[PDB]
Structures are given as structure tokens and as C-alpha cells.
Coordinates of C-alpha atoms (C1' of nucleotides) and ligand atoms in Angstrom, one line a residue:
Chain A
X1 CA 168.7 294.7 131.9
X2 CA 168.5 297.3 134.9
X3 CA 172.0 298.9 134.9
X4 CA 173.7 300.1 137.6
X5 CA 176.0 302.6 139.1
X6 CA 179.1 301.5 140.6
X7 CA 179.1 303.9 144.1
X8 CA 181.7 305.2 146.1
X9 CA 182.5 302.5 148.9
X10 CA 181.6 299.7 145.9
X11 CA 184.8 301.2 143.9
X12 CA 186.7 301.4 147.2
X13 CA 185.6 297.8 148.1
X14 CA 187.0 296.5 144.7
X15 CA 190.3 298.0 144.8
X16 CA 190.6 296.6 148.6
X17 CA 189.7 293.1 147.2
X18 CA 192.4 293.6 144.6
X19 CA 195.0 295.2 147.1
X20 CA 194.6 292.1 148.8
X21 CA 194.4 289.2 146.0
X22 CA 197.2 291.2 143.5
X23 CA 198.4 288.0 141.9
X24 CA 194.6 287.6 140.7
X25 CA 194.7 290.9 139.0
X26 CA 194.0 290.1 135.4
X27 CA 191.7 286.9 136.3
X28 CA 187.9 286.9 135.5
X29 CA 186.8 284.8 138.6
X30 CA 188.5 287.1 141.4
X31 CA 185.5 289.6 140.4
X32 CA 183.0 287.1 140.2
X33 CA 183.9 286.2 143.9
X34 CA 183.2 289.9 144.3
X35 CA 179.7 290.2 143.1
X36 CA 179.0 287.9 146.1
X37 CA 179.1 291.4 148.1
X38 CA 178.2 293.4 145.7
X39 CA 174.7 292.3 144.4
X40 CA 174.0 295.4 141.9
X41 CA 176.9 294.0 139.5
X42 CA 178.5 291.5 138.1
X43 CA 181.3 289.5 137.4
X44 CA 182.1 291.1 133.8
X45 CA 180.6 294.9 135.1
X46 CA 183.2 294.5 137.8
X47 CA 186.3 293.5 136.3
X48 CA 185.5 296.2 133.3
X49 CA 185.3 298.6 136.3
X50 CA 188.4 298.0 137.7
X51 CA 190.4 297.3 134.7
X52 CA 189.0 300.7 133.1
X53 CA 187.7 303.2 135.4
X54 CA 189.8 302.2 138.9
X55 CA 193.4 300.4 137.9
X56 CA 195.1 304.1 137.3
X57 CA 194.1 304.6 141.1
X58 CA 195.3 301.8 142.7
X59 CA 198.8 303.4 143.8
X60 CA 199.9 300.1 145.7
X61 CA 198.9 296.7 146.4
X62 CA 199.8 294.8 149.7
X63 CA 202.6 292.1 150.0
X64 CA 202.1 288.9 149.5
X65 CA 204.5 285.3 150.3
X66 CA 206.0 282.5 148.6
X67 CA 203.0 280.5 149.6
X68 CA 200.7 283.5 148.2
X69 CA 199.3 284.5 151.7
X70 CA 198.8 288.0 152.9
X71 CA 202.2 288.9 154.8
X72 CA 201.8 291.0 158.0
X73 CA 204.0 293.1 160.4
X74 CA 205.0 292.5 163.7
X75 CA 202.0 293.9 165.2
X76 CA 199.3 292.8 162.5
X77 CA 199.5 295.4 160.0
X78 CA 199.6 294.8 156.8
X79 CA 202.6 295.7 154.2
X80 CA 201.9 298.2 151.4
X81 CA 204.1 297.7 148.6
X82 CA 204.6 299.7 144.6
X83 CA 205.1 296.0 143.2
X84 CA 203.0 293.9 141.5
X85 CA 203.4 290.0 142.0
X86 CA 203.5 287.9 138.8
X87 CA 200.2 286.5 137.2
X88 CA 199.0 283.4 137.0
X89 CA 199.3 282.2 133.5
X90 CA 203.7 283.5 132.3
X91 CA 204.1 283.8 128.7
X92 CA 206.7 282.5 126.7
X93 CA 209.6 284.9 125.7
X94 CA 211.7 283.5 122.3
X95 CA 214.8 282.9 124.6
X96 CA 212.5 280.6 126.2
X97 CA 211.2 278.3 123.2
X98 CA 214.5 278.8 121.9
X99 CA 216.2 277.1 125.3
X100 CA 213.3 274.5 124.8
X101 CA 214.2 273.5 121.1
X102 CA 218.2 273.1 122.0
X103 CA 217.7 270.5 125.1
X104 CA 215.0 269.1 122.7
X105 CA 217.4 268.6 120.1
X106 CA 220.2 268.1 122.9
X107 CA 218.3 265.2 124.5
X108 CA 217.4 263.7 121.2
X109 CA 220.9 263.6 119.8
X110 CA 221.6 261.9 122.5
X111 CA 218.5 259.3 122.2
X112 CA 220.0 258.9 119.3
X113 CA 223.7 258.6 118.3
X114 CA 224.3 257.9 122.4
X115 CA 227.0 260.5 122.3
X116 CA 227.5 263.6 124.0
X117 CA 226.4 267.2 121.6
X118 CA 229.1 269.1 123.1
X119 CA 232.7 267.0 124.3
X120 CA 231.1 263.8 122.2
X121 CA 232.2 260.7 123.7
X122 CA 230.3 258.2 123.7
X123 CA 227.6 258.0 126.4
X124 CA 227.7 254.1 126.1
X125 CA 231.6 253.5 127.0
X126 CA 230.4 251.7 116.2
X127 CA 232.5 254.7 115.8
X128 CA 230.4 256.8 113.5
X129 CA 231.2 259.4 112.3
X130 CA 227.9 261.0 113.3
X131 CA 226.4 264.8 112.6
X132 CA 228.9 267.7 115.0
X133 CA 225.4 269.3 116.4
X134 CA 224.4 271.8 115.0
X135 CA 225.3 269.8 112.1
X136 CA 222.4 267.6 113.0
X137 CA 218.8 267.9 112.0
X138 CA 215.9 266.9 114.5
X139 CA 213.8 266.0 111.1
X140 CA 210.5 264.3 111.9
X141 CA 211.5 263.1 115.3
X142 CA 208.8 263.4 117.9
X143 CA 210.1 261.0 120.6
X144 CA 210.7 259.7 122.6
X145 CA 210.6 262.0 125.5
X146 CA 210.7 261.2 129.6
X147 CA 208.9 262.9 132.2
X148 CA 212.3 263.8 133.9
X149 CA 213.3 265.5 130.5
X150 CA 210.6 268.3 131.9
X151 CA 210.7 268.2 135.5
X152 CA 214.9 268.5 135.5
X153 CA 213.8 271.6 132.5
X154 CA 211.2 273.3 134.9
X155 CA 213.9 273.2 137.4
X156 CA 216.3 274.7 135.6
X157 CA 214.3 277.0 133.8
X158 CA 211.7 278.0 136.9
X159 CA 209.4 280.7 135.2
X160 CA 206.9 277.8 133.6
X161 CA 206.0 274.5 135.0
X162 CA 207.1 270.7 134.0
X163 CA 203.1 270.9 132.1
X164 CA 203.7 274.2 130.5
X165 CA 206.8 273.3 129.3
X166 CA 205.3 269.8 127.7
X167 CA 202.6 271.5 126.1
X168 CA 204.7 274.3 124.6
X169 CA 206.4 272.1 123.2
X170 CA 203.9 269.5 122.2
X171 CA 201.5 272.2 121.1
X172 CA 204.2 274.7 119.3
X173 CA 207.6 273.6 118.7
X174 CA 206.0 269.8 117.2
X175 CA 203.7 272.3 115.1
X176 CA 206.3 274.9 114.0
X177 CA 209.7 272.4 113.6
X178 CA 212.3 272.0 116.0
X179 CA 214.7 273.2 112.9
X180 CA 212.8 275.6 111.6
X181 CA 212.5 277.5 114.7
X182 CA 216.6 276.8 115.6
X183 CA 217.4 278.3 112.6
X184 CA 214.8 281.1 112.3
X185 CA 216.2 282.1 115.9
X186 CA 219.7 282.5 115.2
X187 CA 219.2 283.9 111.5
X188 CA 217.3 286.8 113.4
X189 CA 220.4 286.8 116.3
X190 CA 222.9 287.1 113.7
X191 CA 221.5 289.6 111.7
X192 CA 221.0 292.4 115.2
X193 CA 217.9 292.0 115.8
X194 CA 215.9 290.3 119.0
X195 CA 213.4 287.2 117.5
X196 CA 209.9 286.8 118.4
X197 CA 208.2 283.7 120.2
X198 CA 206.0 280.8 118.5
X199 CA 202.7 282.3 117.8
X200 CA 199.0 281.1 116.9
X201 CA 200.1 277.2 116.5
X202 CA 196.9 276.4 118.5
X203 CA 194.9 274.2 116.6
X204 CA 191.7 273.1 119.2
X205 CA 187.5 273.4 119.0
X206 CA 182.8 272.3 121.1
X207 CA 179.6 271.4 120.8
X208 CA 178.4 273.5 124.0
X209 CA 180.8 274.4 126.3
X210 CA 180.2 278.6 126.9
X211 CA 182.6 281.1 125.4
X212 CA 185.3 281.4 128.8
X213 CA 185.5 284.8 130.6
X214 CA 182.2 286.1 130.4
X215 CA 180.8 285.9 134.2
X216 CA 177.7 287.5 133.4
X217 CA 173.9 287.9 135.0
X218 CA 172.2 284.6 133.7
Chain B
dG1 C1' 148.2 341.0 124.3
dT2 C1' 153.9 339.8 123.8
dG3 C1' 157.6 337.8 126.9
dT4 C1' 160.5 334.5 130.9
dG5 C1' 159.6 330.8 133.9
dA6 C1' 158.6 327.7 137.9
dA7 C1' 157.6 315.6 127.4
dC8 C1' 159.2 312.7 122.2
dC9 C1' 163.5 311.7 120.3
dA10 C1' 169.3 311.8 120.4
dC11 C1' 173.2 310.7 122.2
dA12 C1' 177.7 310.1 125.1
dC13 C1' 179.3 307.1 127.6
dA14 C1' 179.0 304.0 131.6
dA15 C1' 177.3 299.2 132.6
dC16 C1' 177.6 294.9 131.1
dA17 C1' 178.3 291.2 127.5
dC18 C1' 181.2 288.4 125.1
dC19 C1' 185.7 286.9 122.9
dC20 C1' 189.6 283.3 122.1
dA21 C1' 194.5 281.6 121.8
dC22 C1' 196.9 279.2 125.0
dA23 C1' 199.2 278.3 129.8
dC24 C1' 198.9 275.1 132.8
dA25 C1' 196.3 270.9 134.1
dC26 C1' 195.1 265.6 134.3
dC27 C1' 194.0 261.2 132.9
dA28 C1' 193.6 256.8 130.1
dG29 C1' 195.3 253.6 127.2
Chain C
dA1 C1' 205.6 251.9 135.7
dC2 C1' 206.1 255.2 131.2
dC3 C1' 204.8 258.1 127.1
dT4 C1' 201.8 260.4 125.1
dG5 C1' 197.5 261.9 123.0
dG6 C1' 192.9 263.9 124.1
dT7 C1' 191.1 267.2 126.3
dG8 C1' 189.3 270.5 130.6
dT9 C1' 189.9 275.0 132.4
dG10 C1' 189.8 279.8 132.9
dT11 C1' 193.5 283.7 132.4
dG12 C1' 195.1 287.8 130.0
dG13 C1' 194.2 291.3 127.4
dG14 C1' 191.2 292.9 125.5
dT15 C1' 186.6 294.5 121.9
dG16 C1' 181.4 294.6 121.1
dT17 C1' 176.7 295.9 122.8
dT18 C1' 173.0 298.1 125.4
dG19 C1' 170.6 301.0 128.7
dT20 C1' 170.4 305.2 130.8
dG21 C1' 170.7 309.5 133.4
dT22 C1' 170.9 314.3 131.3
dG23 C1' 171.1 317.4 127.1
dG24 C1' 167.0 319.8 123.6
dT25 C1' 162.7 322.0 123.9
dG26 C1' 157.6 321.9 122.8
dT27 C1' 154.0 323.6 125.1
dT28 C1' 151.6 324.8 129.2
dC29 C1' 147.7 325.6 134.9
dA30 C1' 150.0 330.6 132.6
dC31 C1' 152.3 334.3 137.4
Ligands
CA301 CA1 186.9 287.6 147.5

DNA sequence: GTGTGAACCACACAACACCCACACACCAG
DNA sequence: ACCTGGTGTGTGGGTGTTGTGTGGTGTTCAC
């Protein structure tokens, strides 16, 4: 209902807005914010606008800091740069769930036997003999897990958060099997060829609750 | 009396709608 | 205090749908 054409200084005011917000990029709420100045549009015209007709155009974005502010020069200006900041939401790369799974299994063998995979010695000081990880088989266990299991993980392994990291693997490695994925990863790594990441685990509904990323008219 | 010449139906494609698995989140029991 | 399930939220990378400014083009004050 009444369409309209996206003008000259409209298409330059979007790709300033993006210039200037570059870690919001892909979002759907960025150009929703947008329509605020642009009353003709809206949210979902503007993004499909960008993304489409105006992305192979935007030649640079401007540099932004650690603490995702706008960086200037010495005497205001701002700093034109050819490289794009990361997104919001990082994917997982199979290196990644596969570094998951091991201090999973790691910290659990550890719950467990209270000996150390890898020099094992005893974490206490009876004498087994227990299973020479990767001997060991994480089979049905689910737990316990501590809050600084994640938080020392996110640490180490910066790219996703201390809640990322939980959900991936409550959400996918709990739904694929700490085993199964161990061993489907190194089959693959043995046999030359790169392995692929957990994939379509998510198992999740609502009664209303409005389809996301459709910031539309009404 | 025979020619150039100054509004219905289609249709390409832009405007806009809508999609959904999951990354990252927070809280309660 | 601690783990852990239940669940909110909106990003990321799209595809699906509709309305519309310009083709045909048919006549037509006929000039
Ligand atoms: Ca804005």
C-alpha cells in the first residue's frame, strides 16, 4: 500500500547511517532506526535497499573502537577504513564445537575418575586402572558443569561468549553426542578432508509472538 | 478521402513483506 | 551460593509478494 521510490539523498543517507554503525550491518533494527528519518519507507523496504540495490557501492565504512564508538582524528575527522568490523551474532566453525566437546569430555573425566586426561595422576593426592582418554566415552553424561567451566572457556577461546558457549553446547553437542561428534571430527581429519559444524539441532516453538525480522508498516 | 500525430490490459522489476534456525541472553527453582 | 532448564530476543542471510511507473496501442477534437 502506496509504494515508494527510494531518492537520491535517501540512498546516500542510508549508506552514511551504515558507514557509521558497520558492526550493525546485517541487523534488521539498524534500518528500522532509519525509517525514523525517512518517513516514505520502512524498516524491511530499507534494509532490502541497502542489502540489494546499495551494498556493492559502499567502498568503505568508518573506524570504529574496542568500545564500538566512532573513532576520530586529531582534528575531528573521521577515519575511512576498507574493513568491515565483525557482526553481532559469530558463528560456530567445527574447530570450535570440536574444542568445546574435548574440555567437555576433559573436564568430565576429570569429575569423574579425579585424574588428570593427559600426565594422569591423580588430582586427589583406589588405583584404577581407569579409561587412557580417548579411551574414555562421555556416554550419557550431562553434568555436572560449573559456571567457571565457561567463563575460563570464553576466555580462552574469545570469539563467542561464556552464554554462547553454554548454549552451544546445551543446545547441540547434548543433542548430537559428545562421542559421536569426537569421533565424526577426527574420522573426517584423518581421512584429508576439513569437517563441518553441528547443524539444525534446534528443537524450539508460540502461540503469538510475530515471525522476527519483519519491521514492516503496521 | 487515405495517412502521421500532437486509454484497457501486461509486465518487469523495484518496494515491501515475511521467514526461521540459532547466537547470545537471563532468570527461577 | 550453584546448576540448570525454560525461554526471550532479534540477527544473519536470505526468499516470497505486490504495486507501479512505463511499454502497447485503440481511437480520436482530427491539423
Ligand atoms: Ca540511526
Amino acid at each position: 500500500h502506496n509504494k515508494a521510490s527510494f531518492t537520491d539523498e535517501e540512498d546516500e543517507f542510508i549508506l552514511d547511517v551504515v558507514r557509521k554503525n558497520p558492526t550493525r550491518r546485517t541487523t534488521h533494527t539498524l534500518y528500522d532506526e532509519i525509517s525514523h528519518y525517512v518517513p516514505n519507507h520502512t524498516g524491511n523496504s530499507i534494509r532490502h535497499r541497502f542489502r540489494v540495490y546499495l551494498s556493492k557501492r559502499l567502498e568503505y565504512v568508518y573506524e570504529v573502537d574496542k568500545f564500538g564508538k566512532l573513532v576520530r582524528d586529531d582534528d575531528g575527522n573521521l577515519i575511512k577504513t576498507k574493513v568491515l568490523p565483525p557482526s553481532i551474532k559469530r558463528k560456530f566453525s567445527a574447530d570450535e564445537d570440536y574444542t568445546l566437546a574435548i574440555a567437555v569430555k576433559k573436564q568430565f573425566y576429570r569429575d569423574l575418575f579425579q585424574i588428570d586426561p593427559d600426565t594422569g595422576r591423580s588430582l586427589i593426592t583406589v588405583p584404577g586402572s581407569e579409561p587412557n582418554f580417548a579411551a574414555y566415552r562421555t556416554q550419557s553424561r550431562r553434568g555436572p558443569i560449573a559456571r567457571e567451566f565457561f567463563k575460563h572457556f570464553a576466555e580462552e577461546h574469545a570469539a563467542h561468549t561464556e552464554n554462547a558457549w553454554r548454549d552451544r553446547f546445551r543446545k547441540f553437542l547434548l543433542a548430537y553426542g559428545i562421542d559421536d561428534y569426537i569421533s565424526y571430527y577426527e574420522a573426517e581429519k584423518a581421512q584429508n578432508r576439513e569437517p563441518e559444524p553441528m547443524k539444525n539441532l534446534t528443537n524450539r516453538p508460540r502461540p503469538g509472538v510475530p515471525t522476527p525480522g519483519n519491521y514492516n508498516s503496521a
